[PDB]
Coordinates of C-alpha atoms and ligand atoms in Angstrom, one line a residue:
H1497 CA 22.4 17.5 -4.8
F1498 CA 24.1 15.3 -7.4
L1499 CA 25.2 11.8 -6.4
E1500 CA 26.1 8.4 -7.8
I1501 CA 24.6 5.2 -6.6
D1502 CA 25.7 1.9 -8.3
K1503 CA 27.0 3.9 -11.3
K1504 CA 23.6 5.6 -11.4
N1505 CA 23.2 9.4 -11.5
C1506 CA 20.7 10.4 -8.8
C1507 CA 19.6 13.6 -7.1
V1508 CA 18.9 13.1 -3.4
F1509 CA 17.7 16.0 -1.2
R1510 CA 17.9 16.5 2.6
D1511 CA 15.9 19.7 3.1
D1512 CA 13.7 21.2 5.8
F1513 CA 9.9 21.2 6.0
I1514 CA 10.3 17.4 6.3
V1515 CA 10.5 17.5 10.1
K1516 CA 7.4 19.7 10.2
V1517 CA 4.6 17.8 8.4
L1518 CA 5.7 14.2 8.1
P1519 CA 6.4 13.3 11.8
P1520 CA 3.1 14.8 13.2
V1521 CA 1.1 12.9 10.7
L1522 CA 3.1 9.7 11.1
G1523 CA 2.8 9.8 14.9
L1524 CA -1.0 10.1 14.8
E1525 CA -1.1 7.4 12.1
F1526 CA 0.8 5.1 14.3
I1527 CA -1.2 5.8 17.5
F1528 CA -4.5 5.3 15.6
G1529 CA -3.5 2.3 13.6
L1530 CA -2.3 0.6 16.8
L1531 CA -5.8 0.8 18.4
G1532 CA -7.7 0.0 15.2
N1533 CA -5.6 -3.0 14.2
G1534 CA -5.4 -4.3 17.8
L1535 CA -9.2 -4.3 18.1
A1536 CA -9.4 -6.0 14.7
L1537 CA -7.0 -8.7 15.6
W1538 CA -8.7 -9.2 19.0
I1539 CA -12.1 -9.6 17.3
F1540 CA -10.5 -11.9 14.7
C1541 CA -8.1 -14.3 16.6
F1542 CA -9.7 -14.5 20.1
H1543 CA -13.2 -13.1 20.5
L1544 CA -14.6 -14.8 17.3
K1545 CA -14.2 -18.5 16.3
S1546 CA -15.5 -18.9 12.7
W1547 CA -13.1 -19.0 9.8
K1548 CA -14.8 -18.4 6.4
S1549 CA -12.9 -18.1 3.1
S1550 CA -13.4 -14.3 2.8
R1551 CA -12.5 -13.9 6.5
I1552 CA -9.1 -15.5 5.8
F1553 CA -8.4 -12.9 3.2
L1554 CA -9.6 -10.2 5.6
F1555 CA -7.3 -11.6 8.3
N1556 CA -4.4 -11.6 5.9
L1557 CA -5.0 -7.9 5.1
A1558 CA -5.2 -7.2 8.8
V1559 CA -1.9 -8.9 9.4
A1560 CA -0.2 -6.9 6.7
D1561 CA -1.7 -3.7 8.0
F1562 CA -0.6 -4.4 11.5
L1563 CA 2.9 -5.3 10.5
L1564 CA 3.1 -2.1 8.4
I1565 CA 1.8 0.0 11.4
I1566 CA 4.5 -1.6 13.6
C1567 CA 7.1 -0.7 11.0
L1568 CA 5.8 2.9 11.0
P1569 CA 7.3 3.9 14.3
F1570 CA 10.8 3.4 12.9
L1571 CA 9.8 5.6 9.9
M1572 CA 8.7 8.3 12.3
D1573 CA 12.0 8.1 14.1
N1574 CA 13.8 8.3 10.8
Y1575 CA 12.0 11.4 9.5
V1576 CA 12.4 13.0 13.0
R1577 CA 16.2 12.9 12.6
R1578 CA 15.9 14.7 9.2
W1579 CA 16.9 11.7 7.1
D1580 CA 19.5 10.1 9.4
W1581 CA 19.1 6.4 9.9
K1582 CA 20.8 5.7 13.3
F1583 CA 20.0 2.0 13.5
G1584 CA 22.3 0.0 11.3
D1585 CA 22.6 -1.7 8.0
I1586 CA 20.7 -5.0 8.5
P1587 CA 17.7 -3.1 10.1
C1588 CA 17.6 -0.7 7.2
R1589 CA 17.4 -3.4 4.5
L1590 CA 14.9 -5.3 6.7
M1591 CA 12.8 -2.2 7.1
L1592 CA 12.8 -1.4 3.4
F1593 CA 11.9 -5.1 2.6
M1594 CA 9.1 -5.0 5.1
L1595 CA 7.7 -1.7 3.8
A1596 CA 7.6 -2.9 0.2
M1597 CA 6.4 -6.4 1.0
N1598 CA 3.4 -5.4 3.2
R1599 CA 2.5 -2.5 1.0
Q1600 CA 2.3 -4.9 -2.0
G1601 CA 0.5 -7.5 0.2
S1602 CA -2.1 -5.0 1.3
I1603 CA -2.8 -4.0 -2.3
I1604 CA -2.9 -7.6 -3.4
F1605 CA -5.2 -8.7 -0.6
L1606 CA -7.5 -5.7 -1.3
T1607 CA -7.6 -6.8 -4.9
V1608 CA -8.4 -10.4 -3.8
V1609 CA -11.2 -9.2 -1.6
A1610 CA -12.6 -7.2 -4.4
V1611 CA -12.4 -10.1 -6.8
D1612 CA -14.1 -12.3 -4.2
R1613 CA -17.0 -9.8 -3.9
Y1614 CA -17.2 -9.7 -7.7
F1615 CA -17.6 -13.4 -7.8
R1616 CA -20.1 -13.4 -4.9
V1617 CA -22.3 -10.8 -6.5
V1618 CA -22.1 -11.2 -10.3
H1619 CA -21.3 -14.9 -10.6
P1620 CA -23.1 -16.5 -7.6
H1621 CA -22.9 -20.0 -9.1
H1622 CA -19.2 -20.2 -9.8
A1623 CA -16.9 -22.7 -8.0
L1624 CA -14.7 -19.9 -6.5
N1625 CA -17.7 -18.9 -4.3
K1626 CA -17.6 -22.1 -2.2
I1627 CA -14.0 -23.1 -2.0
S1628 CA -12.5 -25.1 0.9
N1629 CA -10.3 -23.7 3.6
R1630 CA -7.3 -25.7 2.3
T1631 CA -7.5 -24.0 -1.1
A1632 CA -7.9 -20.6 0.5
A1633 CA -4.9 -21.1 2.7
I1634 CA -2.8 -22.3 -0.3
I1635 CA -3.8 -19.2 -2.2
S1636 CA -2.9 -17.0 0.7
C1637 CA 0.5 -18.6 1.0
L1638 CA 1.0 -18.4 -2.7
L1639 CA 0.2 -14.6 -2.7
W1640 CA 2.6 -14.1 0.2
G1641 CA 5.3 -16.0 -1.7
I1642 CA 4.7 -13.9 -4.8
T1643 CA 5.1 -10.8 -2.7
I1644 CA 8.4 -12.0 -1.2
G1645 CA 9.6 -13.1 -4.6
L1646 CA 8.9 -9.6 -5.9
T1647 CA 10.8 -7.9 -3.0
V1648 CA 13.9 -10.1 -2.4
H1649 CA 15.5 -7.7 -4.9
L1650 CA 14.8 -4.8 -2.5
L1651 CA 16.1 -7.1 0.3
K1652 CA 19.4 -7.5 -1.6
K1653 CA 20.0 -4.5 -3.7
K1654 CA 21.8 -2.1 -1.3
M1655 CA 22.6 -1.0 2.2
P1656 CA 22.4 2.5 3.9
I1657 CA 24.3 5.0 1.8
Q1658 CA 26.6 7.7 3.3
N1659 CA 26.0 11.2 2.0
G1660 CA 27.2 14.6 3.2
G1661 CA 27.5 14.2 6.9
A1662 CA 24.7 11.7 7.5
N1663 CA 23.3 8.4 6.1
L1664 CA 20.2 7.8 4.0
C1665 CA 18.2 4.6 4.0
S1666 CA 15.7 4.8 1.2
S1667 CA 14.6 2.9 -1.9
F1668 CA 12.3 5.5 -3.5
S1669 CA 15.1 7.7 -4.8
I1670 CA 15.1 9.5 -8.2
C1671 CA 17.7 8.3 -10.7
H1672 CA 18.0 8.5 -14.5
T1673 CA 17.1 4.8 -15.1
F1674 CA 13.9 2.7 -15.3
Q1675 CA 14.6 -0.3 -13.1
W1676 CA 12.1 -3.0 -12.1
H1677 CA 11.3 -1.2 -8.8
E1678 CA 9.6 1.9 -10.3
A1679 CA 7.8 -0.2 -12.9
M1680 CA 6.7 -2.5 -10.1
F1681 CA 5.3 0.5 -8.2
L1682 CA 3.4 1.7 -11.3
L1683 CA 2.1 -1.9 -11.9
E1684 CA 1.1 -2.4 -8.2
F1685 CA -1.0 0.6 -8.5
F1686 CA -2.4 0.4 -12.1
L1687 CA -3.2 -3.3 -12.5
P1688 CA -5.1 -3.6 -9.1
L1689 CA -6.6 -0.2 -9.9
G1690 CA -8.1 -1.7 -13.1
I1691 CA -9.2 -5.0 -11.4
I1692 CA -10.8 -3.1 -8.5
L1693 CA -12.6 -0.6 -10.8
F1694 CA -13.9 -3.4 -13.0
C1695 CA -15.1 -5.5 -10.1
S1696 CA -16.8 -2.5 -8.4
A1697 CA -18.4 -1.3 -11.6
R1698 CA -19.7 -4.8 -12.3
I1699 CA -21.0 -5.3 -8.8
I1700 CA -22.8 -1.9 -8.9
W1701 CA -24.3 -2.6 -12.3
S1702 CA -25.4 -6.2 -11.5
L1703 CA -27.0 -5.2 -8.2
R1704 CA -28.9 -2.3 -9.8
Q1705 CA -29.9 -4.3 -12.8
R1706 CA -31.2 -7.3 -10.9
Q1707 CA -33.6 -5.0 -9.0
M1708 CA -31.8 -5.2 -5.6
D1709 CA -31.5 -1.5 -4.6
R1710 CA -34.8 -1.7 -2.8
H1711 CA -33.2 -3.7 0.1
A1712 CA -31.8 -1.7 3.0
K1713 CA -28.5 -3.3 4.0
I1714 CA -27.6 -3.7 0.3
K1715 CA -27.6 0.0 -0.1
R1716 CA -25.0 0.2 2.8
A1717 CA -23.0 -2.6 1.0
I1718 CA -23.0 -0.6 -2.2
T1719 CA -22.0 2.6 -0.5
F1720 CA -19.2 0.8 1.4
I1721 CA -17.7 -0.9 -1.7
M1722 CA -17.9 2.5 -3.4
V1723 CA -16.1 4.3 -0.6
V1724 CA -13.5 1.4 -0.5
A1725 CA -12.8 2.1 -4.2
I1726 CA -12.7 5.9 -3.6
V1727 CA -10.4 5.7 -0.6
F1728 CA -8.0 3.3 -2.5
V1729 CA -7.9 5.8 -5.3
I1730 CA -7.4 8.8 -3.0
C1731 CA -4.7 7.2 -1.0
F1732 CA -2.7 5.8 -3.9
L1733 CA -3.2 8.5 -6.5
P1734 CA -0.9 11.4 -5.4
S1735 CA 2.1 9.1 -5.0
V1736 CA 1.9 7.7 -8.5
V1737 CA 1.0 11.1 -9.9
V1738 CA 4.1 12.7 -8.4
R1739 CA 6.1 9.7 -9.6
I1740 CA 4.9 10.1 -13.2
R1741 CA 5.5 13.9 -13.0
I1742 CA 9.1 13.4 -11.8
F1743 CA 9.6 10.8 -14.5
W1744 CA 8.5 13.3 -17.1
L1745 CA 10.8 16.0 -15.6
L1746 CA 13.5 13.3 -15.7
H1747 CA 13.2 12.3 -19.4
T1748 CA 12.8 15.9 -20.6
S1749 CA 15.9 17.7 -19.4
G1750 CA 17.0 15.7 -16.4
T1751 CA 20.3 15.2 -14.5
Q1752 CA 20.5 19.0 -14.5
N1753 CA 20.9 21.3 -11.4
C1754 CA 18.0 19.2 -10.1
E1755 CA 16.6 22.0 -8.0
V1756 CA 13.5 21.7 -10.2
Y1757 CA 13.1 18.2 -8.8
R1758 CA 13.0 19.6 -5.2
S1759 CA 9.8 21.6 -5.8
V1760 CA 8.0 18.3 -6.5
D1761 CA 10.3 16.0 -4.5
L1762 CA 8.9 17.3 -1.2
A1763 CA 5.5 16.7 -2.7
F1764 CA 6.3 13.0 -3.1
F1765 CA 7.3 11.8 0.3
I1766 CA 4.5 13.7 2.1
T1767 CA 2.0 11.9 -0.1
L1768 CA 3.8 8.7 0.6
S1769 CA 2.7 8.9 4.2
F1770 CA -0.9 9.4 2.8
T1771 CA -0.8 5.7 1.7
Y1772 CA -0.5 4.7 5.4
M1773 CA -3.8 6.4 6.0
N1774 CA -5.2 3.6 3.8
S1775 CA -3.9 1.1 6.4
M1776 CA -5.7 3.2 9.0
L1777 CA -9.0 3.4 7.1
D1778 CA -9.5 -0.3 6.2
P1779 CA -10.4 -1.3 9.8
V1780 CA -13.1 1.4 9.7
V1781 CA -14.7 0.2 6.5
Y1782 CA -13.7 -3.4 6.1
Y1783 CA -14.0 -5.2 9.4
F1784 CA -16.2 -2.5 11.1
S1785 CA -19.2 -3.0 8.9
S1786 CA -21.2 -5.7 10.6
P1787 CA -24.7 -4.3 11.5
Ligands
OKL405 C1 12.4 3.4 6.5 C2 12.9 4.6 5.8 C3 12.7 4.5 4.3 C4 12.5 5.9 3.6 C5 12.3 5.8 2.1 N1 11.2 4.8 1.8 C6 11.5 3.7 1.2 O1 12.8 3.5 0.8 N2 10.6 2.8 0.9 C7 9.3 3.0 1.3 O2 8.4 2.0 1.0 C8 9.0 4.2 2.0 N3 7.8 4.6 2.5 C9 8.1 5.8 3.1 CL1 6.9 6.8 3.9 N4 9.4 6.1 3.0 C10 10.0 5.1 2.3

């Protein structure tokens, strides 16, 4: 129950019902993402030779998704052991760093693709619609650097922590403090949420206003950007909602017996796996949309 991490009062929980739902969903997530991302990378690197600016961003998203899917098997192994990391200390920090970095990278590149579509559809005569490959590669490297800059603190903050009779390797704990990590999670949902919603709404409004809904494939494009927004919201909403709920249960009362946390704590991590479904669904909608 109660524990102290870096002079911080936290309430970890190693309960059951975690080795029941999480490993079956994670295994199927891994075995479907492997095939989807392998086909995407095959059609990207080898079978096709044409690099356009939007395709570079799509390839970056695919790389992030593939790395996250590769990282997923270790997560499945961890949750199978009922929260017992049996790998080491360097692999644990590396795994947490990779998880955070490619989650943020997937979100950032999704936002970048949405902004690119917004510029293509609403502002067709802007410069950012005909950039060179050098500028696109520089932007990609800059975004990757921003991600690493935001996650070196996860890379450095701590190692696996002994508790009870086992060891826990986690960064999404619950503690009575508001560090940069949780605020960064809330930002990495909300700000891209606003950007994506604004871009999608403007795209829909401009396409409908300019009398373009008559065209056939444009209707498919509209429905696909709509389902992209919907799936992003569906995949990233339960996690942030449970995080806000546990924050509220933390500020009001808090640091108590902490059993009241557990009823919602199990709700958090399950929904966390739901975010990986996002990584699974992007190949279906993003790359697999050519008529
Ligand atoms: C590799 C074991 C980490 C377990 C806790 N954890 C985390 O610390 N950061 C995460 O991004 C994350 N995602 C999911 Cl699922 N579990 C997570």
